[PDB]
Amino acid sequence: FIIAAVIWAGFSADDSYADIMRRSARASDRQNYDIIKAALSSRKFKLPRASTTLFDENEPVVRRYQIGRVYAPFPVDRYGSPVYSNCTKVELASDYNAEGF
Amino acid sequence: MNLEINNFAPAISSIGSQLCSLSAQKLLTCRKQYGNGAKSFEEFYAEIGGIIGMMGINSQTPSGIREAIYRLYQSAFLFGDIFPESFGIQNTQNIKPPPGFTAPAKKLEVVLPQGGAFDLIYNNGEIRVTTTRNVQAGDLVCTVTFPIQGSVIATRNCHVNEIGGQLTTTRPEIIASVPMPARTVIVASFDAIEIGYGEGDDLFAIGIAILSNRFNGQITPMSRHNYMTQMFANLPANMSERDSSAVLHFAQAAPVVLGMMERLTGAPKWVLDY
Amino acid sequence: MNLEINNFAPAISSIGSQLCSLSAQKLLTCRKQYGNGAKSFEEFYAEIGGIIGMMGINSQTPSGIREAIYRLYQSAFLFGDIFPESFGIQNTQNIKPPPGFTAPAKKLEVVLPQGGAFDLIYNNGEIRVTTTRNVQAGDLVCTVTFPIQGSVIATRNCHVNEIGGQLTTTRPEIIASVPMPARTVIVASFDAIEIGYGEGDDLFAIGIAILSNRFNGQITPMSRHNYMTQMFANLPANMSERDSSAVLHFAQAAPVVLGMMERLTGAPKWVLDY
Amino acid sequence: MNLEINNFAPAISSIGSQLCSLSAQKLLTCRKQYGNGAKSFEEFYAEIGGIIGMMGINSQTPSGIREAIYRLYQSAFLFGDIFPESFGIQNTQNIKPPPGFTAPAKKLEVVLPQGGAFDLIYNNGEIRVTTTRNVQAGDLVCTVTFPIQGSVIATRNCHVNEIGGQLTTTRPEIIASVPMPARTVIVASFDAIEIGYGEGDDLFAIGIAILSNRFNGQITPMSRHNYMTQMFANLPANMSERDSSAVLHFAQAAPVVLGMMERLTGAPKWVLDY
Amino acid sequence: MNWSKAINFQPFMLETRPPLTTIPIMDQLVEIGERSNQKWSMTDRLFFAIRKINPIFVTSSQIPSKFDYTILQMPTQLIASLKETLLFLAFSYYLREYQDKVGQMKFYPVAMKNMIPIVNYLKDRVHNNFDTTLEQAYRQNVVHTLSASDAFDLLSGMIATTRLDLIQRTRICPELLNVLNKMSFILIYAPNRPSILSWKNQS
């Protein structure tokens, strides 16, 4: 949520960083993150988000204990393609101006 | 057809309409940039037309759009209690109004009140009943159930509440003006527009079958008029006229877009200009 | 046979079918590389047949696979309801389509309408009906309760809704075409496929006994046809036909794999190619 | 159906069958390694199900295989006798043999002698006729127009050429052997195999619609048996059994693969192992 | 477990654990549960959180459960009000940070009145425009409309404890005192004021 707010502070027309940080009261961290993420994958703005999937390929070996699946820390796929949650290419029709930066 | 429309329908319908409009825009854009060559049009569309980036659609192929349409349709109109938390549904506080209806009212639905005193037949633009007995002046003979809007033309031996040629109410009712003998015939023609749109009926036929093959026990293929009448009849009573418009826009946009992705022809204006 | 199938059955059935597929592929591989030697094939399989690459088995022995099958079967078909019906699992975990059914429909199941106007006997692939009284053309004589699909052959004194030799619906009903005097006979034969799989009946016979020894009160030994008819009859009404196939595949595969692990012969293509 | 088969049908069929087998093998290869995550299997197949090294195919997506199948089918079986220069045909004589037929002959096709002497009714695998008038021993009763190979069972009041229970000729003729008066009935049952491949009948029904929605003027939805009877009837007289086998194999494989690319289940053995 | 303190074994809390053979299967279903957002809180918007509040009747204790999604009911015929529903929801939410996550046996409080009608009313009375949160609903329907003593009397009826038992028991178990403190309740017995209970100054 904090990363999303820092990014969205410079693309929103009206809300500043403090205004977005204030949204904590009327919602949750997950819900506010979902809102800002949906705002960053609209027609006006498109910022790809790094994502990952579960991994299940193991090379067989005799062992005593149980085995499980783990997420892949890196955001690339088994076939080398990048994995992104919203869009594959950055296309934003504005400039990032926040607090004079 | 059995279906239960929930309270959360407008939120799903907004996303569905946005997805359909994006698909139509991509289809037309790729249709203008196709140069004749080794690859056929469908191969060209499969490679680039499918790519659309929104939360909840995870594919650069038309199959992803098809699955998204299926999931949203099942969440909104089907009986199973399903909601897709992965789309941009959290920020649906405000909903853009959908385009106004343009479907001509050719077969308008009415209900004879009681007593079997009138026999009903239909025409291209007009209705007419035969009185089987004496009738008093100023009583109800028929009333519409499917809302219409437009002008009234060629009314005979009856009266409707219209001023300046325009009907004042979305549910007009016809009442006799003079006590009339048995075998008299009262008529009323309307140049009005019923619920739903008119363009894209060819795509509707091949999309309703597509989305009926999946939900094989829930949806039966049939014409657009009966589909829309049943959708309107299944709407909850406690719903505004603004949300019902979005729900009924998505309910028709889904089949026409499903059929449009099969036959790579153009797209209707109401689907595209949402 | 009394059993309670919940709304979580497809999710458990996907894991069960994957486990069965992996177990069968290992047996064909071990079976291909056995070299005649002091050690028998049973010991040779039991020493390396459980080493498969699959999460969720806490043992590298056939006993681990057997216990995993037991717990999956108990969770899916015998435990009862798990969680509220609104619990969302389909959105994050998608399942894989099971192979299409291949079991020929020999004893097709039908139910006579009320009134005792008909006599029913069975045959190899057809049913013939004897009228006890006079019957007018165009009324129900039979209707199937076990779904069926395929072609139709040799209809006499009856009409079935079909186009080009192919049945239009999965639940056809038999109606007359000509008025029939009493003691008439009407037949209907189908070259069609019922619900289930036709290969691996020898394995099923002993697998059902193996899993009926453990669940003595719930499951009883029976033929494959009766087992599948009851399993289809116990499916929840509010469930898609795309998930019912996934449930039924595991429902029949579990006895087949249990009996396969005893008689170490080959495996059917339906269990292997999942 | 109306369709013309040119003299170079085997050459087109030998490429179409290879393409179908390649696509099916790729389908199983991708089905074996499906991650079972948030993406459905349809998106997975649409993303990685293409063939990259075959001359003739111009896209790396499944749509390319579909379009190639459409071109090959239109060239081989439809009115346009267009020779596809795009696929590389070097020798029109070399033709890999196709797998042998596996379709059981349930509804055997027979024609009466034209004397109006017998009545014909059908059964599961046998035909039986009743004599309208007196008939002497040693004359034709029935003859089959659809070639059939297999064994003979339950031959009563008739004679067929047989060696050790096996039929001699591929088109047996039924001749009465005893002077039989007074409207008697003769039977003839065959445990034989007709033309085509029984497996994968579900995919044929869904693929024939797919390829009839395109060639609607020439192809109509129907059952597999009627489709194969007409396809065999349209074969040229100057055609050997080695070539007609390839033509019929492609004729059945094309709808099956077209319907398999929609419902991503497994593939039949006769398609995989071509 | 000793780590579960002594609050998990109170008379008003019921322990649940699935059949032993099905424990491995239930563990991997709830994992798909956390992969989805199958949980609710107080500091979240009601628009979707109202969907994931589904109390069930406890016929038997051998039932599977997720600690962040399960709400139990006793099979009775009495119907609770809205304030009682919110009080029980707050209690159950703030009581689950003492859940014993190592031992398989989960412990949940059991409501003594039916909560289905109020949940359905809220779920059908909620729209896309409104931004109300579960915590805000609790505040505006309990904290700002009732006295602390009345709210405590209501809460006790939901958990089948005499208000005297709960008040006495808070003196022995600091965990229960913290749980009540999270709900804006304050218990100071030092001055002889008219009421032992009061609401916490907000902001």
Residue B20, CB half-sphere, CA atoms under 13 Å: how many?
A: 32
Burial class (CB in 10 A: 0-12, 13-18, 19+), C115: exposed
- Residues B21 and B17: their CA atoms lie apart, in Å, by 6
| CB of C238 less than 8 A from some CB of B | yes
Q: Which residue among E35, E52, E64 sits closest to C82, beta carbon to beta carbon?
A: E64
Contacts of E28 (CB under 8 A, 6+ apart): C56
The amino acid at residue E173 is C
Tell me how the structure was determined: cryo-EM
DSSP state letter for D104: B
Phi, psi dihedral angles at E171 (to 5 degrees): -75, -20
Residue D192 CA from chain centroid, whole number: 15
Strands E106-111 and E72-73: parallel
Q: Which helix or strand (DSSP H or E) is residue C169 part of?
A: none
In degrees, to the nearest 5, what angle opens at C-alpha B160 toward C-alphas B155 and B166? 90
Q: Which residue among E45, E48, E124 sits closest to B7, beta carbon to beta carbon?
A: E124
DSSP state letter for E47: H
Which chain A residues touch E41 with a CB distance below 8 Å?
28
Which chain C residues touch D201 with a CB distance below 8 Å?
150, 193
In degrees, to the nearest 5, what angle opens at C-alpha E100 toward C-alphas E96 and E106? 80
> Which residue of D lies nearest to C154 if distances are taken between CA atoms?
D122
Q: Which residue among C99, C163, C273 sits closest to D221, beta carbon to beta carbon?
A: C163
Which chain C residues touch A63 with a CB distance below 8 Å?
60
DSSP state letter for B97: P
Give the ranges where chain C is alpha helix by DSSP (H): 9-32, 41-48, 62-73, 201-214, 224-233, 241-260, 269-272
Cα–Cα distances in Å, from D113 out to B211, C194, D116, D174, D184? Answer: 50, 37, 7, 11, 17
DSSP state letter for C76: I
- Residues B154 and B191: their CA atoms lie apart, in Å, by 10
DSSP state letter for A41: B
Residue D61, CB half-sphere, CA atoms under 13 Å: how many?
A: 20
Cα–Cα distances in Å, from A94 out to A13, A45, E99? Answer: 10, 8, 49
Resolution in angstroms comes to 3.1
> Which residue of A lies nearest to D36 if distances are taken between CA atoms?
A54
| CB of D67 less than 8 A from some CB of B | yes
C237: helix, strand or coil: coil
In degrees, to the nearest 5, what angle opens at C-alpha E151 toward C-alphas E145 and E157? 135
Residue for token pair 């194969």: D228
Q: Which residue among C58, C74, C92 sits closest to E36, beta carbon to beta carbon?
A: C92
Residue for token pair 């405000």: B94
User: Other C-beta atoms within 10 Å of B206: how many?
Assistant: 18
User: Other C-beta atoms within 10 Å of B82: how many?
Assistant: 16
| CB of C58 less than 8 A from some CB of A | yes
Taking alpha carbons only, the member of B14, B75, B74 closest to residue B212 is: B74
